[PDB]
């Protein structure tokens, strides 16, 4: 009989059952979207959007809800920080319930298309045998897809009718959902400009209308029809799978490297922000500016917002977790309570020592302190034997500016070593570790898990594309070869 | 075609010129395969002979330097360049081939042209299987080496800081990359890697055991002690005894194959699944999603000095690898670790 | 057809290739002996790895200025 890996092939030549299974899968996906929105709202804590932000909680679908405009909740809170006075019908729970209702409707429609599969619509009149006009149906779908893309790019994200999209500053300080004007110039191809999204979707939607009209009118040529096997539903399956893992690479790279459609306030910081010292640049630049006009290093560190110092922490990297370190980052290293302050380390004689920050590849990194000019001056030695760089003989003292501890100086070597080991990980923080029974090891971002899932799915879909194109090109030799 | 007139064109003339029996089948895909593959192989043989690595890594990787086969390589470009495409006309080289070679552009050349040569070879497998009217399982099998190549030489460096952390094309450089994955990623402990290991070792087992079983269950067709002359090209009987082979392995191992088609499909299935699992694991490692630690055993070993296992020994060895290899392998970090702070056991 | 048995055993082939094979070998010898390999392929000569300015491994540490920086760091 049929092998288990072939059972779904029963709906190859039955368009009614094909629409039925497309509808049922659509019902499952929408029901998942609603169920996951509900689950995340149940496990969400909006009490601290500055030090317990949403990407620290393992929230996957709420960044995508918020990126397009849904920021208010029926729970009396908005994740941007305000209090939800009149959220309206479209809250997080509103979109969740809408997805559940839509899934129920699609399940009913799938039942109807499973029962009423023998629709005369699926019969070609010329011969009476079932068929699909795949070029024409593709033209119709392209017309609808282009019209939908143009509507979304000219109406939703531009703010004339919809709410716009999530736009933030470069350094991720405030952030909000606002309308963004389209950018038609070369700047419109800047992947960090939010103005690319409306301009792109408008142009792509217009071109979708034009290409859909061309496909509704113009028929394929005969030798192209036989070359690409346009009369077979598996060919369009294979080509669509090709487009799908292409888009999967595109969204995975976009999520990993960062873009305007992947804001850090929703998806977490990227690996490259820690690697290239982006937030660190901003922190010590906002220190040098406003130290250049008085108000020395004792102050103005409190002028540094607690968001920049939080973004300046290796525990917020998406390339610092593990594949089986499941869950939220809070479950890994605890909930961030407050910035303990910038620790400045200094020697005995007068030189300032800086802690070498942890590179991303290392899980364990030795603790060293180096001067301005780039000479290693102190360290926490592994040997400590016949050694002259240790803290107890170099004489390193640690001070704090602008955090939980302000102005305090510690000279005890044990607390100096623990503050150096914390400054190795960037800005020093207190973490409430007892709330989630945190184990201590780092996690991955929603951005990191998104990239992993989509890249793995993308390679699997590359194989699926190859196998399905193989089946289309070699349809006649599937049972074997012609013997003669 | 298909009881129609269809007057001939330049496409049909070119197609008939390409799809014909030659010393080497060229085909449409050979418009890609032959130049891209020739350039990838020749670029590797050029870089292993003349192109230096003194500026990208501070190493030596060419025969002109004094390196042999095992040690020479085409080196990945500097971490400063990140994931730059290193076009010879691009910004880093600015058209100039000579300083393009020493900036690491040859690695990008060999990687991109090798990927397109691999695509051309799989398209060639598809084309030749179509022309001879055979099923494309050879191309389905070749899907796994391309999966490994893209996940290792493309997805992993794209996930890390840059092409610098890709494998440089060369034997000792591959060994560096392997020991790098041991020290930094604990790639031995990864379930996807050990699925790849099981797939490759099982495929080798299947290869060896199918060969030995076939070569030891032959039919006679003899009058000569050289069995290799008992085979004719075109006939319709089995050459080795399937039933005797099934009986032998049923009584030796407990289970044995009895379907030739499923036997050869298993011989096809094992290495492809193994290499695909290894590809998925390397894609996980591209984002530093390691199976580095067991949280329960690590917390037990932190709360007990008396707990010592081979896994904890491996963790210590990996710390040793990272700390003793970082300074000389990663010049971009400017890691001048003093001899003081490096991890070290008693004596040695 | 020439099935590779009468073409490598043919004096017509062997006389014409008694000059091209070792002419190629001599050309490859001169490409390395005259330093043209050093010039065109960017490999520094055995006596030109460290200059008076730097005594360690060179570092690129830039991307769009990489061309002139490797110019200034190399042995001219």
């Amino acid at each position: 009989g049929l092998p288990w890996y072939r059972v779904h092939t029963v709906v190859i030549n039955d368009p009614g059952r094909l629409i039925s299974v497309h509808l049922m899968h659509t019902a499952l996906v929408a029901g998942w979207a609603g169920a996951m929105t509900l689950f995340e709202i149940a496990v969400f804590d909006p009490s601290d959007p500055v030090l317990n932000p949403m990407w620290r909680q393992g929230m996957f679908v709420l960044p995508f809800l918020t990126r397009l405009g849904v920021t208010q909740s029926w729970g009396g809170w908005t994740i941007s920080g305000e209090t939800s006075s009149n959220p309206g019908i479209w809250s997080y729970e509103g979109a969740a319930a809408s997805h559940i209702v839509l899934s129920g409707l699609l399940f009913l429609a799938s039942v109807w298309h499973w029962v009423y599969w023998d629709l005369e619509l699926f019969r070609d009149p010329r011969t009476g045998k079932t068929a699909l006009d795949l070029p024409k149906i593709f033209g119709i779908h392209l017309f609808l897809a282009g019209l939908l893309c143009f509507g979304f790019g000219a109406f939703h994200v531009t703010g004339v009718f919809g709410p716009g999209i999530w736009v933030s500053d470069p350094y991720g300080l405030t952030g909000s959902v606002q309308p963004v004007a389209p950018s038609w110039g070369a700047e419109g191809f800047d992947p960090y400009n939010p103005g690319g999204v409306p301009a792109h979707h408008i142009a792509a939607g217009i071109l979708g209308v034009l290409a859909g009209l061309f496909h509704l009118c113009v028929r394929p040529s005969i030798r192209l029809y036989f070359g690409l096997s346009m009369g077979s539903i598996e060919s369009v399956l294979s080509s669509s799978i090709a487009a799908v893992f292409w888009a999967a690479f595109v969204v995975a790279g976009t999520m990993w490297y960062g873009s305007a459609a992947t804001p850090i306030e929703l998806f977490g910081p990227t690996r490259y922000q820690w690697d290239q010292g982006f937030f660190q640049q901003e922190i010590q630049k906002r220190v040098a500016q406003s130290t250049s006009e008085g108000l020395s290093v004792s102050e103005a560190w409190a002028k540094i917002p607690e968001k920049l110092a939080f973004y300046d922490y290796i525990g917020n990297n998406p390339a610092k977790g593990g594949l089986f370190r499941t869950g939220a980052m809070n479950s890994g290293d605890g909930i961030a309570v407050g910035w303990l302050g910038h620790a400045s380390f200094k020697d005995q004689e007068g030189r300032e020592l800086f802690v070498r920050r942890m590179p991303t590849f290392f899980e364990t990194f030795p603790v060293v302190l180096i001067d301005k000019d780039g000479v290693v001056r102190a360290d926490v030695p592994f040997r400590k034997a016949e050694s002259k760089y240790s803290i107890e003989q170099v004489g390193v003292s640690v001070t704090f500016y602008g955090g939980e501890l302000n102005g305090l100086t510690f000279t005890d070597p044990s607390t100096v070593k623990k503050y150096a080991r914390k400054a190795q990980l960037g800005e020093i923080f207190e973490f409430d570790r007892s709330t989630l029974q945190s184990d201590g090891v780092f996690r991955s971002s929603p951005r990191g898990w998104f990239t992993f899932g989509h890249l793995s799915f993308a390679l699997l879909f590359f194989f699926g594309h190859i196998w399905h194109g193989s089946r289309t090109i070699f349809r006649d030799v599937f049972a074997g070869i012609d013997e003669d | 075609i298909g009881t129609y007139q269809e007057k001939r064109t330049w496409f049909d003339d070119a197609d008939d010129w390409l799809r014909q029996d030659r010393f080497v089948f060229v085909g449409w895909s050979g418009l890609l395969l032959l130049p891209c593959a020739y350039f990838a192989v020749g670029g590797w043989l050029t870089g292993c002979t003349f192109v230096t690595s003194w500026y990208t890594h501070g190493l030596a990787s060419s025969y002109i330097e004094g390196c042999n086969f095992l040690t020479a390589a085409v080196s990945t470009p500097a971490n400063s360049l990140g994931h730059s495409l290193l076009f010879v006309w691009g910004p880093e080289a600015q058209g100039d081939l000579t300083r393009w070679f020493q900036l690491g552009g040859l690695w990008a050349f060999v990687a991109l042209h090798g990927a397109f040569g691999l695509i051309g070879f799989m398209l060639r497998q598809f084309e030749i299987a179509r022309s001879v009217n055979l099923r494309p399982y050879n191309a389905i099998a070749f899907s796994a080496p391309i999966a490994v190549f893209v996940s290792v030489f493309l997805i992993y460096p794209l996930g890390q800081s840059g092409w610098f952390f890709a494998p440089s094309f060369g034997v000792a450089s591959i060994f560096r990359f392997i020991l790098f994955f041991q020290g930094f990623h604990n790639w031995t402990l990864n379930p996807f890697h050990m699925m790849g290991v099981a797939g490759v070792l099982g495929a080798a087992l299947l290869c060896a055991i199918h060969g030995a079983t076939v070569e030891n269950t032959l039919f006679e067709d003899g009058d000569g002690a050289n069995t290799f002359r008992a085979f004719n090209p075109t006939q319709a009987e089995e050459t080795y005894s399937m039933v005797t082979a099934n009986r032998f392995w049923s009584q030796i191992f407990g289970v044995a194959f009895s379907n030739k088609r499923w036997l050869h499909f298993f011989m096809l299935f094992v290495p492809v699944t193994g290499l695909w699992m290894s590809a998925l694991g390397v894609v996980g490692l591209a984002l530093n999603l390691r199976a580095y630690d067991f949280v329960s055993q690590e917390i037990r070993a932190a709360e007990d000095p008396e707990f010592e296992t081979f896994y904890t020994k491996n963790i210590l060895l990996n710390e040793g690898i990272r700390a003793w290899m970082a300074a000389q392998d990663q010049p971009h970090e400017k890691l001048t670790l003093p001899e003081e702070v490096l991890p070290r056991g008693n004596a040695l | 057809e020439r099935p590779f048995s009468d073409i490598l055993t043919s004096i017509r082939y062997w006389v014409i290739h008694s000059i091209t094979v070792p002419s190629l070998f001599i050309a490859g010898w001169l490409f390395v002996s005259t330093g043209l390999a050093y010039d065109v392929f960017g490999s520094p000569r055995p006596n030109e790895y460290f200059t008076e300015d730097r005594q360690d491994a060179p570092l690129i540490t830039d991307r769009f200025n990489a061309l002139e920086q490797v110019k200034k760091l190399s042995a001219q």
Binding site: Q276, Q281, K372 | - | -
Partner: peptide, 27 residues
């Protein structure tokens, strides 16, 4: 204020900083 003291301040902490990756012709 000056771009040189920022360069010398971020040289000891992280060496892949983009300002150490740009305009270091004269460095």
């Amino acid at each position: 204020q000056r771009v040189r003291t920022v360069l010398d301040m971020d040289d000891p902490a992280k060496e892949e900083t983009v300002k150490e990756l740009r305009k270091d012709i004269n460095n």
